[PDB]
Design brief:
2 copies of one chain form a homodimer. Chain A has helices at 14-22, 43-46, 72-82, 90-114, 119-126, 130-141, 154-169, 178-188, 191-197, and strands at 2-7, 27-32, 61-64, 67-70. Chain A is an alpha+beta fold. Chain A has 2 domains: 1-85 and 191-217, Glutaredoxin; 86-190, Glutathione S-transferase Yfyf (Class Pi), Chain A, domain 2. The two termini of chain A are 30 Å apart. The structure holds glutathione S-(2,4 dinitrobenzene) (2 copies). One glutathione S-(2,4 dinitrobenzene) binds next to helix 3 and helix 4 of chain B. Chains A, B: Substrate binds at residue 115. Chains A, B: Keywords: Cytoplasm, Lipid metabolism, Olfaction, Phosphoprotein, Sensory transduction, Transferase. Chains A, B: Conjugation of reduced glutathione to a wide number of exogenous and endogenous hydrophobic electrophiles. The olfactory GST may be crucial for the acuity of the olfactory process. Participates in the formation of novel hepoxilin regioisomers.
Chain lengths: 217, 217
Amino acid sequence: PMILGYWNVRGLTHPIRLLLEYTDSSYEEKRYAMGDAPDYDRSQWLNEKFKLGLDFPNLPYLIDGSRKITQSNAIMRYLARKHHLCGETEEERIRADIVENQVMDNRMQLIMLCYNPDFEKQKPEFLKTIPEKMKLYSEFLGKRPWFAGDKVTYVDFLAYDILDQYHIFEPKCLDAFPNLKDFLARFEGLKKISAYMKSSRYLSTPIFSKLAQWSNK
Amino acid sequence: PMILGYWNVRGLTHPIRLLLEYTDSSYEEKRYAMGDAPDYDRSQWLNEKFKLGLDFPNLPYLIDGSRKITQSNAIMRYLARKHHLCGETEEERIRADIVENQVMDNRMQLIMLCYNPDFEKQKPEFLKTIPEKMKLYSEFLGKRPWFAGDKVTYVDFLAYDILDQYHIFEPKCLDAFPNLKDFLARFEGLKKISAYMKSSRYLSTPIFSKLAQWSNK
Ligand SMILES: N[C@@H](CCC(=O)N[C@@H](CSc1ccc([N+](=O)[O-])cc1[N+](=O)[O-])C(=O)NCC(=O)O)C(=O)O
Ligand SMILES: N[C@@H](CCC(=O)N[C@@H](CSc1ccc([N+](=O)[O-])cc1[N+](=O)[O-])C(=O)NCC(=O)O)C(=O)O
């Protein structure tokens, strides 16, 4: 089987776990544990960081037979290509690229708050702008069923994830944008996904390490 | 022709300016200026940010007739597909995905440092990490002439860029790595690139905006 490595948290690997399940990939997980405050030990990871044969060691990582990958985005693309979940036309490919990249940007702005020690003072305002990001997703999506075009591609897994996290941080966000509420239910409604979500394997929260200020436990 | 907008700086758009050149693309640029301390005016950009017909407005952006792209990496990829600068086999495609993403990681680390109000005191720390970074790049490339295999592809434009900025920041960071200094010469050595570097269009520094601690001019 394949091996997926990451922190025993949701964080930025949600999209990959969803995808392995969607493609019915034969995989195993290694979920590393950090230590508690004050030191939050990383030894479980660090003891083996440099012993797996990875080009640029990091988490998440993926081992598949002789193939070893790091960089969450690269792992996504590799599975996309293996099960043919990419865009078919130049139009689709260009939407996919944009969305891949956008999600990363929004994921990071989030972290950095949820990691910003003034999480609170910063909060009110941060979520002052949560709306406008959401609006960008909505108009991009329009009336299509999937982000890239006619069928499901890798990017929907990425879009699903940040939109889910958003409506966790500001439940009242999804509100003005019904096409975003429907996407989330259509994604949640894919057979293989529905089953995963009720499984023992599923890990929705926490999103960050105990180090965070939100979804840290 | 094609239009490229970005700050009148190196920033993250160096790879694009280079690829447009290598490919003999007809294009013009809009180089937005930024006010000076203590307020750093952004209005030349802000006045049109929402009037270009872009899906997720940002800098840089590429208008190619009816195709409007944002996200530096998606612009890099649209150019690569158009000019056949992609990996040709699975191997090359995985190599490229990894490097693309790793570059962005190493670019963000530098930005975070150089924007930190504690530049002076934090630098010594950052300095210590360079040797490790460079080693990973050296060993990945090994003895191949370019990042993905026997042929130039778009990731070489991104790799060049990052390796060139770290070298500017820490002149002695590449001394222990032969293959990296050679890779830099091979790339600067390409016909269309030597020619552009001497042009009135060349812009190597500043690397950052006037609100950074290093190379803000
Ligand atoms: N660009 C890479 C980012 C991977 C990454 O940063 N991994 C973090 C987890 S996420 C993360 C992402 C960004 C930041 N951050 O502070 O900017 C912190 C974390 N984190 O885990 O705490 C990790 O713990 N790496 C193992 C290692 O470095 O040895 C990817 O997309 O795969
Ligand atoms: N993912 C994007 C990042 C685009 C971006 O953040 N652009 C900046 C300049 S670079 C930059 C600027 C700020 C930060 N930042 O972390 O605050 C990071 C970067 N960067 O290059 O990573 C900009 O000025 N945008 C104009 C706007 O938003 O209206 C891209 O790859 O194109």
